[PDB]
C-alpha cells in the first residue's frame, strides 16, 4: 500500500514537471496569427521593431 | 513400534518450515528498503519541479 | 521530457510486479569450484533440506524406493544403493550355491 | 533555460535506463518462481546422473 | 532486534551474489548492501541484542 502511494506521488511529480515545462515553453511560442490580441510579446526577439 | 513409527511420520510431516512467512518477511524488508530509495528519488524530482 | 516521463510512468508498480514473481532463494548463489555460482537450492545436498524445495517430492520418492530413511544425510544415498547392489550379488550367489547343493 | 532543461532530461533518461536494466534482470527465467521441476535431468546435475 | 538483524543479514546476502565486483552488476530493485544496513536497529540495540 505504501509503495502504491509513493508510486502516485512519483507519477504526480513527473506530470508536474511535464506541465511545468509545457507552461514554460508557451512563453517562447510566437503567436503566428495577428488576430489573437491577447498574447503580448514577452521577449524583445518577438518585438516588432 | 508401529505406534512409534506412526508418531514419527507425523513429526516429520509437521516439520514446521515457516519458509513462507520468512519469505514474506524478506520481501517486506527488501520492499521497505526499495520504498525508501524511491522516496529519495521523488524528493529529487520535486526539487527539479520547484526550479 | 514527455517521452522520458512516460518511460518512468508507474515505474514503482512495474518493478514490484516483477519482484513479486521472483524466487528469493534462487538468488542465493554459492561457488563450489570458486568459479561457477550456482543457486544454493540446486545443490545436491539441499534437495531434501526443505519441503518446498523443487526436487523434494521426487527425491522423497527415491528414498522410499531404496528404503533409505528420510533423516539420513543426502550424501549417503549413493553409498547405500551401492551396498544394496552388493547385497543383490551376494543373494544371487547364495541362491546359486543352494540350488547346486539341492 | 536550455542548460536547466537539459539536466532534467538527463536525470529522467538515467533513471529510465536503470529501470530497464533492473526489469530485464527480474525477468530472468532462472529467478522466476518454482517452475514445475523439469521432467528431464539437467546435464549439470551430476549426482542424479551418477 | 534479533529477528531484524537476521533478516537484514539474510537479505544482504541475497543482494551480494558474492559474485566478482563487476562494477556493472544491476542489484535487485537497485538496492545496495548499504540500503539494507540502514534498516538495522540503532547500534546500541544491536550490541545489546548480540550480548
UniProtKB/Swiss-Prot annotation, chain A:
Belongs to the HAUS3 family. This is HAUS augmin-like complex subunit 3. The gene is haus3. It is found in: Cytoplasm, Cytoskeleton, Microtubule organizing center, Centrosome; Cytoplasm, Cytoskeleton, Spindle. The chain holds residues 151 to 199 of 597 of the full protein. It comes from the Eukaryota. Contributes to mitotic spindle assembly, maintenance of centrosome integrity and completion of cytokinesis as part of the HAUS augmin-like complex. Component of the HAUS augmin-like complex. The complex interacts with the gamma-tubulin ring complex and this interaction is required for spindle assembly.
Amino acid at each position: 500500500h505504501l509503495l502504491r502511494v509513493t508510486n502516485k506521488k512519483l507519477n504526480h511529480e513527473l506530470q508536474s514537471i511535464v506541465n511545468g515545462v509545457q507552461t514554460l515553453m508557451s512563453f517562447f511560442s510566437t503567436p503566428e496569427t495577428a488576430c489573437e490580441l491577447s498574447s503580448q510579446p514577452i521577449f524583445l526577439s518577438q518585438l516588432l521593431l | 513400534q508401529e505406534q512409534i513409527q506412526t508418531a514419527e511420520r507425523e513429526i516429520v510431516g509437521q516439520d514446521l518450515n515457516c519458509e513462507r512467512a520468512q519469505d514474506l518477511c524478506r520481501r517486506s524488508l527488501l520492499l521497505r528498503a526499495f520504498n525508501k530509495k524511491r522516496e529519495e528519488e521523488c524528493e529529487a524530482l520535486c526539487q527539479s519541479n520547484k526550479k | 521530457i514527455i517521452q522520458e516521463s512516460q518511460r518512468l510512468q508507474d515505474s514503482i508498480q512495474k518493478e514490484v510486479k516483477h519482484f513479486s514473481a521472483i524466487c528469493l532463494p534462487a538468488l542465493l548463489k554459492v561457488s563450489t569450484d570458486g568459479f561457477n555460482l550456482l543457486p544454493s537450492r540446486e545443490l545436491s545436498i539441499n534437495r531434501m533440506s526443505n519441503t518446498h524445495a523443487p526436487y523434494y517430492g521426487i527425491f522423497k520418492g527415491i528414498y522410499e524406493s531404496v528404503r533409505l530413511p528420510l533423516y539420513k544425510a543426502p550424501e549417503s544415498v549413493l553409498s547405500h544403493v551401492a551396498d544394496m547392489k552388493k547385497q543383490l550379488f551376494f543373494l544371487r550367489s547364495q541362491l546359486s550355491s543352494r540350488s547346486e547343493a539341492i | 533555460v536550455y542548460r536547466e532543461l537539459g539536466s532534467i532530461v538527463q536525470e529522467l533518461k538515467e533513471s529510465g535506463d536503470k529501470l530497464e536494466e533492473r526489469l530485464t534482470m527480474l525477468s530472468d527465467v532462472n529467478l522466476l518462481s518454482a517452475s514445475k521441476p523439469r521432467s528431464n535431468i539437467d546435464s549439470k546435475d551430476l549426482t542424479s546422473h551418477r | 532486534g534479533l529477528q531484524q538483524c537476521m533478516l537484514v543479514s539474510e537479505c544482504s546476502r541475497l543482494l551480494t551474489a558474492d559474485s566478482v565486483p563487476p562494477s556493472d552488476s544491476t542489484s535487485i530493485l537497485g538496492l545496495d548492501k548499504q540500503d539494507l544496513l540502514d534498516l538495522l536497529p540503532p547500534n546500541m540495540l544491536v550490541l545489546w541484542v548480540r550480548d
